Amino acid sequence: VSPPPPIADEPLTVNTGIYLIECYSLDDKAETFKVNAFLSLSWKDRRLAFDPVRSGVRVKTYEPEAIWIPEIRFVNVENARDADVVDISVSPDGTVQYLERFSARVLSPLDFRRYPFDSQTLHIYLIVRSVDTRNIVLAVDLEKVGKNDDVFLTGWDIESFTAVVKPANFALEDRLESKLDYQLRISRQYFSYIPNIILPMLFILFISWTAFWSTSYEANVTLVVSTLIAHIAFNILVETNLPKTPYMTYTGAIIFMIYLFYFVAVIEVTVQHYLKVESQPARAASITRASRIAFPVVFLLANIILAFLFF
Amino acid sequence: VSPPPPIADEPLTVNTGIYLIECYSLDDKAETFKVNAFLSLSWKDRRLAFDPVRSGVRVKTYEPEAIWIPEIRFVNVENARDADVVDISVSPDGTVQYLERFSARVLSPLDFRRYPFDSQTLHIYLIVRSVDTRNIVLAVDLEKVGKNDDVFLTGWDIESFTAVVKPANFALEDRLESKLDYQLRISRQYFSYIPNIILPMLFILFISWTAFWSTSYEANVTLVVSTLIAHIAFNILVETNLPKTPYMTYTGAIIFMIYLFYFVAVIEVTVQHYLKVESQPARAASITRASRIAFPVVFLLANIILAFLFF
Amino acid sequence: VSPPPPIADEPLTVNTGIYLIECYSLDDKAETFKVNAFLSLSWKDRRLAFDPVRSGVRVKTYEPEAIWIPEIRFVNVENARDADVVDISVSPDGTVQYLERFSARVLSPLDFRRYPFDSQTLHIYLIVRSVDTRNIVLAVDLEKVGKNDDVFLTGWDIESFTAVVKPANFALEDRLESKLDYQLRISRQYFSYIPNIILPMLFILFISWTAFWSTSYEANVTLVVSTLIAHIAFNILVETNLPKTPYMTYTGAIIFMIYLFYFVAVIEVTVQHYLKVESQPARAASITRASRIAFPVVFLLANIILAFLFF
Amino acid sequence: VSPPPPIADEPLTVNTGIYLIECYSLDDKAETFKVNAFLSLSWKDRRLAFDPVRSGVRVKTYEPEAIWIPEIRFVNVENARDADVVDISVSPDGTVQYLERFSARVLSPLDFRRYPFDSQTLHIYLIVRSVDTRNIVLAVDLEKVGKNDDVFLTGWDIESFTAVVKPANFALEDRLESKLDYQLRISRQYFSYIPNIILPMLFILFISWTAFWSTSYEANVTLVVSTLIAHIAFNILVETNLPKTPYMTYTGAIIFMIYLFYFVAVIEVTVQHYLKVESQPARAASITRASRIAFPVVFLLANIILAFLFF
Amino acid sequence: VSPPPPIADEPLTVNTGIYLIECYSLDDKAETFKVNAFLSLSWKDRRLAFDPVRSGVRVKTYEPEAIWIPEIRFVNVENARDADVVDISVSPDGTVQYLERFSARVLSPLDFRRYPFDSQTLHIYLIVRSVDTRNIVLAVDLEKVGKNDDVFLTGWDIESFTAVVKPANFALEDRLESKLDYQLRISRQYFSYIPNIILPMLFILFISWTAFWSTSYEANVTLVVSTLIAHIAFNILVETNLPKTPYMTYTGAIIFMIYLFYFVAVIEVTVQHYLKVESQPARAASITRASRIAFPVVFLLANIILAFLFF
Ligand SMILES: [Cl-]
Ligand SMILES: [Cl-]
Ligand SMILES: [Cl-]
Ligand SMILES: [Cl-]
Ligand SMILES: [Cl-]
Ligand SMILES: [Cl-]
Ligand SMILES: [Cl-]
Ligand code: NA
Ligand code: NA
Ligand code: NA
Ligand code: NA
Ligand code: NA
Ligand code: NA
Incomplete structure (x- = not known):
């Protein structure tokens, strides 16, 4: 033919x-x-x-x-x-x-x-x-x-x-x-993604912020470190459903940013304990009270910035 | 032909x-x-x-x-x-x-x-x-x-x-x-699903409620946070056996609702500790005693509502 | 033809x-x-x-x-x-x-x-x-x-x-x-199955029973909750090697029963702490001493009953 | 033809x-x-x-x-x-x-x-x-x-x-x-297998032995239980790369033996705490000091015996 | 033809x-x-x-x-x-x-x-x-x-x-x-690999170093042991994406080296506690203050050496 x-x-x-x-x-x-x-x-x-x-x-x-x-x-x-x-x-x-x-x-x-x-x-x-x-x-x-x-x-x-x-x-x-x-x-x-990943990830992060209403260093360490480990588990879970990209994804950006919030929360918890041991709790109280407002406010503004850059 | x-x-x-x-x-x-x-x-x-x-x-x-x-x-x-x-x-x-x-x-x-x-x-x-x-x-x-x-x-x-x-x-x-x-x-x-997922998930949740019979903040944080992590593990296990749905499943609804119970339990444990540090334990005792009844009661009623909406 | x-x-x-x-x-x-x-x-x-x-x-x-x-x-x-x-x-x-x-x-x-x-x-x-x-x-x-x-x-x-x-x-x-x-x-x-699942599962359970020789509530909570989480990991591991059955398997029956032992151990640990805080340690000591015998005895008898029903 | x-x-x-x-x-x-x-x-x-x-x-x-x-x-x-x-x-x-x-x-x-x-x-x-x-x-x-x-x-x-x-x-x-x-x-x-499984498994085991230089029961429980959980994770990881054998493997033998070391370490930590509560710390100190030598010595000899039986 | x-x-x-x-x-x-x-x-x-x-x-x-x-x-x-x-x-x-x-x-x-x-x-x-x-x-x-x-x-x-x-x-x-x-x-x-593996691995390691600004042994044990477990999770995650090699990979070398940093951090935390119990805190303070500089410095120099040997 x-x-x-x-x-x-x-x-x-x-x-x-x-x-x-x-x-x-x-x-x-x-x-x-x-x-x-x-x-x-x-x-x-x-x-x-x-x-x-x-x-x-x-x-x-x-x-x-x-x-x-x-x-x-x-x-x-x-x-x-x-x-x-x-x-x-x-x-x-x-x-x-x-x-x-x-x-x-x-x-x-x-x-x-x-x-x-x-x-x-x-x-x-x-x-x-x-x-x-x-x-x-x-x-x-x-x-x-x-x-x-x-x-x-x-x-x-x-x-x-x-x-x-x-x-x-x-x-x-x-x-x-x-x-x-x-x-x-x-x-x-x-x-x-909302009830399975997003909301559970937000719940554990907000649970770590309860350390800003506690003077107990050992309980604060437990609060921030345990929730961070749970955040690592969610980060791993998310990356198993996705290929490796030469760019940041919207979820990846939020997940990465949340690590910075856990890191600064550990610093605050450390600074608070250090000052109380040094007999400066009035000062530790000022940092802790400011953190109660700063952490949710910076989290809200950073998410507005991220949502704007991505959508 | x-x-x-x-x-x-x-x-x-x-x-x-x-x-x-x-x-x-x-x-x-x-x-x-x-x-x-x-x-x-x-x-x-x-x-x-x-x-x-x-x-x-x-x-x-x-x-x-x-x-x-x-x-x-x-x-x-x-x-x-x-x-x-x-x-x-x-x-x-x-x-x-x-x-x-x-x-x-x-x-x-x-x-x-x-x-x-x-x-x-x-x-x-x-x-x-x-x-x-x-x-x-x-x-x-x-x-x-x-x-x-x-x-x-x-x-x-x-x-x-x-x-x-x-x-x-x-x-x-x-x-x-x-x-x-x-x-x-x-x-x-x-x-x-009953002995493998449902009952173990209920056991860990009821274990988190033992914090309502404890004044030890450090032990309470350990009780609620550790059981929450175990609940995250069960949530992950359940979602691996299921595809992503544009609707809530009956199990998914219960799993999601249990997070709210863990979140409110952390608030209670935080509020209890805060009041005791503030020399208000009589009050912390009123909230803790009410929580002993409120948590299982609200859990039972919310499950009756969910079972009704789904079946 | x-x-x-x-x-x-x-x-x-x-x-x-x-x-x-x-x-x-x-x-x-x-x-x-x-x-x-x-x-x-x-x-x-x-x-x-x-x-x-x-x-x-x-x-x-x-x-x-x-x-x-x-x-x-x-x-x-x-x-x-x-x-x-x-x-x-x-x-x-x-x-x-x-x-x-x-x-x-x-x-x-x-x-x-x-x-x-x-x-x-x-x-x-x-x-x-x-x-x-x-x-x-x-x-x-x-x-x-x-x-x-x-x-x-x-x-x-x-x-x-x-x-x-x-x-x-x-x-x-x-x-x-x-x-x-x-x-x-x-x-x-x-x-x-003996050195990989059965014996490690028994070791963690026996480790939780060391709480019956401890008055430290914080350490007891850590002992029982941590070993329970390890038991959940073994339960998940076992169920990944098996299909879902409309009946109980011998291993599944033991695994499920062990949860009840962890649950009762948490109750004992809670009851013990509650009485000590209430200035009743003589009584808590009676419950704790009885638990030292009751837990291994009930575990042995329940396993004899299970082995009999299955074999 | x-x-x-x-x-x-x-x-x-x-x-x-x-x-x-x-x-x-x-x-x-x-x-x-x-x-x-x-x-x-x-x-x-x-x-x-x-x-x-x-x-x-x-x-x-x-x-x-x-x-x-x-x-x-x-x-x-x-x-x-x-x-x-x-x-x-x-x-x-x-x-x-x-x-x-x-x-x-x-x-x-x-x-x-x-x-x-x-x-x-x-x-x-x-x-x-x-x-x-x-x-x-x-x-x-x-x-x-x-x-x-x-x-x-x-x-x-x-x-x-x-x-x-x-x-x-x-x-x-x-x-x-x-x-x-x-x-x-x-x-x-x-x-x-040396930097990925063997050495990390040895590091966590040696970390559990730091409890023999500590009188803090709460910290000791945290040291031995947390490292045991990490050992369970390595045991699970090893068994996923291997089929089920009707004999003991060299790695399987070491992994199983390490559980006995964790179990005896929990007993020591329990015995130490019990004696100190009973106002017998001089005696607890004798058991703890002996454990500092006994644990690494018995571990070395048991590994020589195992290596001899397998090679 | x-x-x-x-x-x-x-x-x-x-x-x-x-x-x-x-x-x-x-x-x-x-x-x-x-x-x-x-x-x-x-x-x-x-x-x-x-x-x-x-x-x-x-x-x-x-x-x-x-x-x-x-x-x-x-x-x-x-x-x-x-x-x-x-x-x-x-x-x-x-x-x-x-x-x-x-x-x-x-x-x-x-x-x-x-x-x-x-x-x-x-x-x-x-x-x-x-x-x-x-x-x-x-x-x-x-x-x-x-x-x-x-x-x-x-x-x-x-x-x-x-x-x-x-x-x-x-x-x-x-x-x-x-x-x-x-x-x-x-x-x-x-x-x-930077926001998903490298940076989270560095964050948890730096979190373990906050123990050098804490005298609380129980909180220090929690800080170092919990972050080590998270490091084990990242080590396992990395090795699942790679075959077994008869040589060290650049990532494998860093991952392995980080274990040594966790091991020495546990020794420091143990030594610090031991000296305080022995009524030698002035001395423990000298070791802890030196560790605050030594740990990040040795980490930076060891990484420069590794990067040089590999690239
Ligand atoms: Cl084609
Ligand atoms: Cl067809
Ligand atoms: Cl055919
Ligand atoms: Cl052929
Ligand atoms: Cl030719
Ligand atoms: Cl070809
Ligand atoms: Cl030729
Ligand atoms: Na044609
Ligand atoms: Na035809
Ligand atoms: Na703890
Ligand atoms: Na024919
Ligand atoms: Na032919
Ligand atoms: Na041709």
Whole structure:
């Protein structure tokens, strides 16, 4: 088999469409997601023209091996897609209607800067390489682009699934390549992070601040050190759900900042004890009373600054 | 091969059945379950009809490649099913009896609102796409729907395996699609959650309340802070067995509420110490004595409210 | 190809045998084990009979596709077995000797009631479905049932590998099915549980009982609470190696009971301190002295009761 | 195709060789290792003999399907090897030279008695089953046994890769079987265990012994209990890297013994406090001073005894 | 098919090129990385030469089976590459242009000495084995070596992708082997290690040094022991992201050194308490005041020494 011949000198247009059936396993650490979808392809092959009068049938059904099929691949996939041909329908003029159902693990970079209040644009890049006899170009059939109503991505809200209609045509290894960008817009369901991570982290921090209403050094050391250890546990828990980033994430910034609050609280607790042993409790009382206001105030202002810089 | 031709204009009815052999790996985080079952298919192909008295044979056995077989797929599967054809039998009138044994990983959303006292309806969606020559519709042969007595799903009780007899017929990408809903009703075996999570979580909370019978601030801080850390460990353990939900689960609600009880207990312990240092122990005694009743009473009432809102 | 015709009306007997080469990956949580074995099949096919004199051969070798072979399947497997045909030999009377080497992941329920001092009976269910032409029945060739001397299952002792000679013949989807039960009896190597879990768990519990020889409330709170946290860690460790069961396991029962001992120890420590503060130490001394005997005695008797109920 | 006929009655000798290209993933828990190697096979087939003078060709190249090839398998593999034929060459006398590149996951038991200062002998068992026409025997071509210079097994030192030249010939299921033992000798790189596990474990134990220079019961309880919890963490960490063994490992023996030292240290701390409360500090001082010498001395002697019993 | 015959006695030159499409999953523990790339091959086959005038074409497109193709393999891969042929083109003089898209898991040793401020040279080794008929040698077509601009390796910066132009020609089992070294230079994005591991580890260590401004032994024991436990948690966390090395890593050296600082801090805290109990506090004050300077000074100098030895 060889590609369809050009009537003039034009490239062969392969109309494409992706219909999402299932979306699952969005792995934040791996920056991957699994997809199960329909891939529709359409091109004119005049060598397959037929008379419905002679053949009896109005539409011809072919096996993939019997006819020429464009070598369509995905750019951003771990391994080649697991594909099963559903139908190959050829109409009298030679217009081929190809339909396959596929499953693939897609590589798509994620921006964690606003985590867990982040939104992402997942990409599925469709590609075709031009052959010697003729250049192959990709197009989007908007009528064949969509998603099933039941498509759910655990821990995410699906906003839209659209395609950039204009392909990216470029030279690669002395041949033309036609690339299409299918975009799946999603927003993270931040809900569960509030009762599971955010609020427990705030509770332990506020518990450490009870040391500002205590003169007992040994109880203060227990309050600040124990809650710090619990904060380390939450820091470790958060970083297990995330990849290592060359930038600070919103959660990472708050988590890091809270360490400074624990560190200054230890200094205050140390300074307070030192002065009381030195028979200067009036002075220790001034520092402790100021800390009761300073710690929640500086914490509120620093969080307003952080929220502003990130959102 | 081509589909059987219609006698009038009727769609081709493909009778279906699923017989469960094995049910395993219900993954709560992934919202998947693995299945090993028999898939039975039945349709009329008049081009295959034969005389019973002339032929001598009452049934004719065909290889899948020798005859036309409807392209039956599962909607909610990770990858295409691993299938092996068991038998193909044709009766004199041309009624085809198809049987295959398959294995598949099924995507089925789970409602965790009542966890670990939750019940689920797992779905297996059967689908057929119509051809240009004729429309293909699915039907349920109730005699061929069932499950093996030995079918066990670890940590779950299997209630029923039924099929919604009426298919969901709809247009998808300019062709008819016939969808059947096979439902596997299950209820969670909550047993183990009681001695492993619920009771140990209650024991540590009740241990924190012993601080209401102690005047020792240093020991009280140790009691409330250490038990809170153990509660954080149980919160982390519970969330590792569950996916992130855009709603509160029953267990999640209790776990979150218990943090408030630890927080108020720290306030009480702080207030008690502060008053004793201020030479007001008669007062600290009134707050401590009230706390001995208030804490278990508010805990009981809040749990009755939560159980009512969730069940 | 079609099944061998009956001389009278008798069912076709397929003699079976399983020879274990490798046993590995017994997953307690998944209730699975992997197997690598020889599967031997034997049946009479008169159509393949030959005379040794005119043929010059005492035996005839065939390719699987050249002759009829019974569709033998495993009931309790995750996916269909990975099989490679080793040999197909035909004797003059048409007696076929089939041999394949296979690998499979087997689903077999485990009884954890006596864990880690439990014994299991793993099952490998062989099955054949009858055809319209004739009924196919399975039999056991005891001479072809066995295991390699080097067969080792990590963390387990292999007792026996036998087959229930009488098949379970029953109707499934209007066709008769012949099922054989191959049983692999194993006993858990409990050894490592003693120095790694049992003894460390007993040491921390006995350490909490040193509080009965101390009047220091602050030190007592530290002793009981810290060891309880270590007991929670062991409870979590044990439950990670086990699936969730709708019954109590022997280890689970001891682990749960130990929480009650920690809870009563906290009450004793609280009662002791309360009385001392109330200027009643003579009385606290009576409760503490009684606890020194009561705690180890009640622990010994409760363990005798538990061991009796479980073994 | 059929096997080469014997000139007299001799068995067919299949000369073998394994050349290791890659060694990776030595899984201690699973007792497996992955291998990527060349498998070389050589045997005489007189039916393939040719004249080198008239043919003008010294060697003939065949495709696997064109000639008879012995069914060579591995005994100790999870699944059948993933093999690709590299070359088949036939000399004028009919000597066939077969070469394939394969990858396999090998099951090989490990002796953990001396862990992490252990050495292992990994096995790769080559096997051939005799055919009815003739007996097949295996041999080692030492000229075709070896390993690539770059072969590295992470966390291990590769000593040698040799083959036991004499095959193990035995009857299995009424046929002869010829088995070869390829041995890969390795020694564990214990280096990292010293700064990561051994020394931190010794530091915390020596920190618990500072309680022998303290009269403060509350601080002593904190010293011994906190370090014991850290020892439990190291015990858990060590057991996660190891399978469960029906014997004591060297590390396991030390870890278990250290618990006894923590237990006796708690007794000493309890006895010391009890005597001081009883107004007997002169006596408590004698026990504490003796403990300062006894604890490190008994620890040193017990470790010498353990090292002697294990090495 | 047979290899192209030599015009004189020259070896067959196979020009190669690798164009990286995707780089993902750099596993530090496994010392592997996954790659998705184009593999280009070019060689002269005179038997395929044609006249452009006579044929009416300037290029000839073949199927892989129709012509001779060199058996090109990767040395350092887990399993054989997953490859799909994209195009095969023949010029009039018999110059073959082969293009395939492949995916492979590559084994490449990593030097962790400078972790997490390390740089690596990942290798992809291309190999060809000579045939009895002729010697095959590999070459690099620099015009066909490169990478896509979007190629990202999570947690790493990609510096360059170059090839060592001269192959490593050597004998392996009496046949010439031609090996090419494709090098992917990467540098670790150390950023996240600073707020997640380095700084929290420094904060807890500096918190342990507050004990040098405290005379309270019980609070000092709590300060040093609790922070040491948190340091053990960070040591465990770091070692889970790394394989076991027969050398010290930069992070491993700092982590190990910090244990010595905790150990000496416990000695100081013990010595201080012992002297105060012995009625020698003036002396304890001299040791404590010296420790306030000695600990941060020795820590700074030891870190300068370590940074110098490692970088
Ligand atoms: Cl693809
Ligand atoms: Cl399917
Ligand atoms: Cl099977
Ligand atoms: Cl094999
Ligand atoms: Cl390869
Ligand atoms: Cl050489
Ligand atoms: Cl050569
Ligand atoms: Na084609
Ligand atoms: Na068909
Ligand atoms: Na304390
Ligand atoms: Na057959
Ligand atoms: Na062959
Ligand atoms: Na070829």
